[PDB]
Amino acid sequence: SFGKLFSRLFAKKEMRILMVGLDAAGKTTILYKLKLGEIVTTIPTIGFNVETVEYKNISFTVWDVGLWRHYFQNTQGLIFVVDSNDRDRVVEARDELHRMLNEDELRDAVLLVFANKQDLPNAMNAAEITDKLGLHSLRQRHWYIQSTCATSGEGLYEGLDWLSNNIASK
């Protein structure tokens, strides 16, 4: 499944794909669903828990948003996970997304937004999320938004296919 997607990137030097988002967005769930290796938790500085899956030359690195700079230098992809059902935190998610995009060291990173929890009845759809995250206003960035249900895995392949293809082409 996902392994073949990411083995496209074999030619690259050691790289990072950062996946961030507010607490409860579904990040840990997605990491587990990838099935690309054990999720290992480290605490590099007091109060800062990082989860990492190392698959071949790729480190999937996950923390909650809402001294990160040393991680950015080899980050090729940025995945931003939003709870599509959490209307009351979408403004906060927009702010955290754009602060991340304001980091000079992430200028060239490819952006994948997972609009997660699409299984939920009252979830905002991907178009609403796009509007509310100000994605249409980005002009230099390569970005894509993908509707997902992390607990079933639905949508993960499609979004990761896009992400890996976009990094690979560089």
Ligand X SMILES: Nc1nc2c(ncn2[C@@H]2O[C@H](COP(=O)(O)OP(=O)(O)O)[C@@H](O)[C@H]2O)c(=O)[nH]1
For binding to Mg ion (CB under 5 A), which residues are involved? 27-28
26 is in an annotated binding site: yes
Beta 110-116 vs 48-55: how paired, if at all? unpaired
Work out the burial of residue 69: count CB atoms within 10 Å of its CB; fewer than 13 is exposed, 13-18 middle, 19 or more buried: exposed
Backbone angles phi, psi at 46, to 5 degrees: -50, 130
Q: Which amino acid is at 96?
A: E
Query: Applying CB under 6 A, which of residues 120, 131, 134, 138 lies at the interface with ligand X?
Result: 120
Nearer to ligand X, 127 or 170 (CB): 127
| Buried/exposed 112-121: b ≥16 CB within 10 Å, e otherwise | bbbbbbbeee
Interface with ligand X includes 119 (CB under 6 A)?
Answer: yes
* Residue list 35-74, contact with ligand X (CB under 6 A): none
26 is in the binding site of which of ligand X, Mg ion, none (Cβ under 5 to 8 A by kind)?
A: ligand X
Gap between the Cα atoms of 73 and 70, Å rounded: 6
Number of residues this chain uses to bind ligand X (CB under 6 A): 15
Nearer to ligand X, 9 or 146 (CB): 146
Query: Applying CB under 6 A, which of residues 129, 150, 160, 167 lies at the interface with ligand X?
Result: 150
168 is in an annotated binding site: no
Beta 40-45 vs 15-22: how paired, if at all? unpaired
In this structure, what DSSP letter does residue 6 have?
A: H
Q: Which residues are annotated as a binding site for GTP?
A: 21-28, 64-66, 116-119
The binding site for ligand X (CB under 6 A) comprises 21, 23-29, 116-117, 119-120, 149-151
Q: Which residues are annotated as a binding site?
A: 21-28, 64-66, 116-119
